[PDB]
Amino acid sequence: HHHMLHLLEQIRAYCETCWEWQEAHNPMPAPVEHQICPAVCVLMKLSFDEEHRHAMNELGGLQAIAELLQVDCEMYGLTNDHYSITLRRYAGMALTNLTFGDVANKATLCSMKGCMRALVAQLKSESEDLQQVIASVLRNLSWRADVNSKKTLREVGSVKALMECALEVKKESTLKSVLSALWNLSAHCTENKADICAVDGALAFLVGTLTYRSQTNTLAIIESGGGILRNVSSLIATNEDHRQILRENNCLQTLLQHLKSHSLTIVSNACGTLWNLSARNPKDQEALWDMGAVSMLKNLIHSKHKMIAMGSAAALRNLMANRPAK
C-alpha cells in the first residue's frame, strides 16, 4: 500500500520527466538512472494477487504502467538493450494482470490509442519473451471486447501483426500466446477473419498447427490453431483460392482424424471447421464422402458436449443433402 504508492509515484514522476523532454525536443532521460525497472518489477509481482490489484486500481496503476510502456517505446523504439526489454516485459505483464477479468480496464486500455499502437509495434521486436508478453495483453483485451474495443483492436492492425509474428516465432511458448490472442480476435468480425486469410502463407501455417508436435507434451497449439481455423473457415468456405491451400496441405484428412481426439476442444474445433467446409462446394463434399465423414460424424451427434453435437449434426446435414453419385 505505502510501498505501492511509492512505486507508482516513481513511475508517474518518470513519465512526467519524459513528457517534458518530448515536448522540448536538456538530456534524454534514461530509465536506468531513475531505477524504473525495479519499480515495475515489484508492481508486476504484486499484480498477481487479487487484493493488491484492487489497491493498484484505486491508485491508477493501469494509467501509470501503460503510460510508462508507451513513452519508453516512443523514446527508444525497437531497441535490444536488456534494460528496456525487461522494463517493457514487466510493464506488459502487469497490464496483463490488471486486464484479467476487469471489464473497465480492458475497455480503458483499448481507448488509449497511443499505448495500443506502441504495444502492437512491439510484436516485431527480436525479443520473443517481449513478443509473448504483448500477445498476452492482446489476448486479454480481445476476450469479451465491447463494441469500441473491437473497433480499436482492428484499427491498430493487431490481427495482421499477430499473424505475421506467428510465422516468425521460433519458441513454442511465444506461439501459444500469439495463437491464443488470434483465437479471440478471429471471432470478432469478418474483417478480422479476412485479415488472417490475406496474410501470405498464414492459412498453410494454420493447417500446419493441426499436426504440431509439442515437446512440452501439450495440445495447446493444436487447439488454438484449430480454433483460429474453425473461426476463419466460414470465410474459406466461399473462397476457392483459400480452399485450395487447405487441399494442398491435406486439411480435411487431418480434421477427420481430429474427430478421434480425446481433447473435447479439438473435436469441437474440427466439427465447426467441417460444418463450414461441408457447405456449397461439391469437390470438398465429395472428398468428405470418400473419406467416410458421414459415419464418423454420426458417432458424435448424440454427444453430451453441446458444440460437438451441434457442429457434427450441422456438418452431417450438409453432407446428407448434396449426395454424390455412388
Binding site: 498477481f48 496483463t96 494482470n97 484479467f100 476476450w143 483465437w183 479471440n184
Partner: peptide, 13 residues
C-alpha cells in the same frame, strides 16, 4: 476461444 489469463506463463523459469 483463447480465453483470458494472468501473466503466469511469462514468469521466468
Amino acid at each position: 476461444g483463447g480465453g483470458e489469463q494472468l501473466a503466469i506463463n511469462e514468469l521466468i523459469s
